[PDB]
C-alpha cells in the first residue's frame, strides 16, 4: 500500500527479483522489496497523466527503468540517481507500453496511434515506425 | 489611448519566470534551460547570468530587502542567490515534484512555493528556511 | 507567452512578459503623479496606495514640518471626495477655489473646499483661464470651446486649420498644432502670435510677462525663454494689421534658451 491511484503495471527487477516496481496512474513508480510494507523509494515521473507501464533494462551494465504514459512520452530512468536519462517523443496518442529488448540495443513502444516504434537504446532516436494495420 | 513603448526586447531560450526589481531597472528571467538572468532593461546591459541547473526553472522572484533572488526548478529545488555577488545562499529540496510558482510575503520573512505534488509550502527564512506549514 | 510581471510600484507603468523566444519589457504610459498644489499650500491628489484611483485626497503644507531637505514631509491626509472617472490630470483653477479632474474623454469641476460639483462634460483637453472663472477645452469633435462661469460662450472661437494636439493655460490661450504653438487672446480668441517650436509644455510667469516654452527636443535647445509685450499686441490689434498665419512679431522677444532637460518648472519672479 502507498499508491494513490490505479496500479497499471508491476514488474520484477530481473537482476534482483527480491525487489519489483509498480507503475501507477498517480504519476509515480514505486520500487519495493518483498517483506517490506513501505517502498525502498518513490520516483516521480513528471508525466502528468500517470504511468501506464514500467520495465527494467535486463542487462548489468546499467540500472535503468522505463515508463510509458498517456501524456505521449516515454522516459528512461536510472533508479540509483532517480534521474531521467532520456525522453522519447514521437507518438501521437497514448503510449500503452515501452520495453527494452533482451538482446537488441533497442526499445519497443506501442500506442493508441496504432503504432509500434523501435528506438535506439543508445542514441534514443526513433529507428522504425510500423503500423501492422490492427488499430490501437 | 495607452502610450505603449517597447523599452527593451531580448532573445533567449524560453523564459518561464520573470520579475521586476523594485528600485533597480532590472528584470529577472528564469529559463527553460536552467539559466537565470538579470537585465538592466534601461541600459540594455546584462547584469548577471547563472546556470542554476540543467532542469527548467519555472519560478523566480527578487527579494530586494535581502539582495537576493529565489528560484524554483523542475529538479524540485529552491535555491537562493545574492544578486550582488552571485553567491548561493541556500539550496534545498522543497518538494518531491516540479515547482510551479513562488510568492514572497511583502512584510514577513515568508515564501510560498506551489508544486505538482498538489501542495503549497510555507518557508520562513528568519528560521533557517524551515518548513512552517504545508497546505 | 508564458509569464508576466508588472513593476511593483508602477514606475513608468513597466510590464514584462516571457516567451518561447525571450522576453520584452514595455512601458504603458508616463507615470507623472496626478496632483496639484494651490497658491497657499493646499495639496490635492488622486489615488495612492490603499485607496481607489478615483479617490481624491488633500493635505495642507504648513510652516511647521520640522524635517530635512532629504526626508519626505508628514502632512495630515484627509478625504476630499471621490470622482466618477479614472483621474488622468488634476488641476486647481489659478484661484485654488476650483479643482478640475480630466478622465478619459471627460472633465468634472469641483469646489476645492467642500467638493461641490460645478460642471462636467465631454473633453479631450482642459485648461483654466487666468480668470479662475473661465476655461477652454477640446470637445469630442476635436474643437476648442470657451466657457465663462461654467457657461459656454458661443460666438467665441479660434478656427484652426489642422488638428489640435493640446492646450496650455497662462496669460494667453496656448494651443499646440501642426508642430507650432499658437497663442490666442482669451477674450476674443484673436491670434496674438505663432511660435515655431514643437513645444512639450508652456509655462507662464506670475505676471504674464515671461514664458518658458519647453521644446520636445526629440533629437537643439531644451527650452525657450520669451518676453511678452502685451502693449505691442494691443497696438497692432488696434491697427487691424495682424497677420493671420503668425500674428504679431513685436508681441514677443526671444531672450535665452536652455540646454538642460526640463521635467517641470515654475517661475518665481
TrEMBL record, chain C:
Keywords: Cytoplasm, Cytoplasmic vesicle, ER-Golgi transport, Golgi apparatus, Membrane, Protein transport, Repeat, Transport, WD repeat. It comes from the Eukaryota. It is found in: Cytoplasmic vesicle, COPI-coated vesicle membrane; Golgi apparatus membrane. GO terms for molecular function: structural molecule activity. Its main location: membrane. The coatomer is a cytosolic protein complex that binds to dilysine motifs and reversibly associates with Golgi non-clathrin-coated vesicles, which further mediate biosynthetic protein transport from the ER, via the Golgi up to the trans Golgi network. Coatomer complex is required for budding from Golgi membranes, and is essential for the retrograde Golgi-to-ER transport of dilysine-tagged proteins. Oligomeric complex that consists of at least the alpha, beta, beta', gamma, delta, epsilon and zeta subunits. This is Coatomer subunit beta'. It comes from Saccharomyces cerevisiae (strain YJM789). The gene is SEC27.
Amino acid at each position: 500500500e502507498g499508491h494513490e491511484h490505479f496500479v497499471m503495471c508491476v514488474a520484477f527487477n530481473p537482476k534482483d527479483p527480491s525487489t519489483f516496481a509498480s507503475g501507477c496512474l498517480d504519476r509515480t513508480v514505486k520500487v519495493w522489496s518483498l517483506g517490506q510494507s513501505t517502498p525502498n523509494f518513490t520516483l516521480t515521473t513528471g508525466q502528468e497523466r500517470g504511468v501506464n507501464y514500467v520495465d527494467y533494462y535486463p542487462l548489468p551494465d546499467k540500472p535503468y527503468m522505463i515508463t510509458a504514459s498517456d501524456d505521449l512520452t516515454i522516459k528512461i530512468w536510472d533508479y540509483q540517481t532517480k534521474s531521467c536519462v532520456a525522453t522519447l517523443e514521437g507518438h501521437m496518442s497514448n503510449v500503452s507500453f515501452a520495453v527494452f529488448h533482451p538482446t537488441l540495443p533497442i526499445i519497443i513502444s506501442g500506442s493508441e496511434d496504432g503504432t509500434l516504434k523501435i528506438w535506439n537504446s543508445s542514441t534514443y532516436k526513433v529507428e522504425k515506425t510500423l503500423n501492422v494495420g490492427l488499430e490501437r | 489611448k495607452l502610450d505603449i513603448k517597447k523599452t527593451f526586447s531580448n532573445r533567449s531560450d524560453r523564459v518561464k519566470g520573470i520579475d521586476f526589481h523594485p528600485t533597480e531597472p532590472w528584470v529577472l528571467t528564469t529559463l527553460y534551460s536552467g539559466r537565470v538572468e538579470i537585465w538592466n532593461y534601461e541600459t540594455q546591459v546584462e547584469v548577471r547570468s547563472i546556470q542554476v541547473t540543467e532542469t527548467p526553472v519555472r519560478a523566480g522572484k527578487f527579494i530586494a530587502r535581502k539582495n537576493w533572488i529565489i528560484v524554483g526548478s523542475d529538479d524540485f529545488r529552491i535555491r537562493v542567490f545574492n544578486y550582488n555577488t552571485g553567491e548561493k545562499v541556500v539550496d534545498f529540496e522543497a518538494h518531491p515534484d516540479y515547482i510551479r510558482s513562488i510568492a514572497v510575503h511583502p512584510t514577513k520573512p515568508y515564501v510560498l512555493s506551489g508544486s505538482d505534488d498538489l501542495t503549497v509550502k510555507l518557508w520562513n527564512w528568519e528560521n533557517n528556511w524551515a518548513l512552517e506549514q504545508t497546505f | 507567452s508564458w509569464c508576466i510581471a508588472t513593476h511593483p510600484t508602477g514606475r513608468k507603468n513597466y510590464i514584462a512578459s516571457g516567451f518561447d523566444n525571450g522576453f520584452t519589457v514595455l512601458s504603458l504610459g508616463n507615470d507623472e503623479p496626478t496632483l496639484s498644489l494651490d497658491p497657499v499650500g493646499k495639496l490635492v491628489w488622486s489615488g495612492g496606495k490603499n485607496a481607489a484611483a478615483s479617490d481624491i485626497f488633500t493635505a495642507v503644507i504648513r510652516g511647521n514640518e520640522e524635517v530635512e531637505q532629504d526626508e519626505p514631509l508628514s502632512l495630515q491626509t484627509k478625504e476630499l471626495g471621490s470622482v466618477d472617472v479614472f483621474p488622468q490630470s488634476l488641476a486647481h483653477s489659478p484661484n485654488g477655489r476650483f479643482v478640475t479632474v480630466v478622465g478619459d474623454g471627460e472633465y468634472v469641476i469641483y469646489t476645492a473646499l467642500a467638493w461641490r460639483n460645478k460642471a462636467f462634460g465631454k473633453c479631450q483637453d482642459f485648461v483654466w483661464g487666468p480668470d479662475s472663472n473661465s476655461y477652454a477645452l477640446i470637445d469630442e469633435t476635436g474643437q476648442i470651446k470657451y466657457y465663462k462661469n461654467f457657461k459656454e460662450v458661443t460666438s467665441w472661437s479660434v478656427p484652426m486649420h489642422s488638428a489640435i494636439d493640446r492646450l496650455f493655460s497662462g496669460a494667453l490661450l496656448g494651443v499646440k498644432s501642426d508642430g507650432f504653438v499658437y497663442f490666442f487672446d482669451w477674450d476674443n480668441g484673436t491670434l496674438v502670435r505663432r511660435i515655431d517650436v514643437n513645444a512639450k509644455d508652456v509655462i507662464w510667469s506670475d505676471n504674464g510677462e515671461l514664458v518658458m516654452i519647453v521644446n520636445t527636443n526629440s533629437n537643439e535647445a531644451s527650452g525657450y525663454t520669451l518676453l511678452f509685450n502685451k502693449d505691442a499686441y494691443l497696438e497692432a490689434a488696434n491697427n487691424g494689421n495682424i497677420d493671420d498665419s503668425e500674428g504679431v512679431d513685436e508681441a514677443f522677444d526671444v531672450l535665452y534658451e536652455l540646454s538642460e532637460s526640463i521635467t517641470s518648472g515654475k517661475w518665481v519672479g
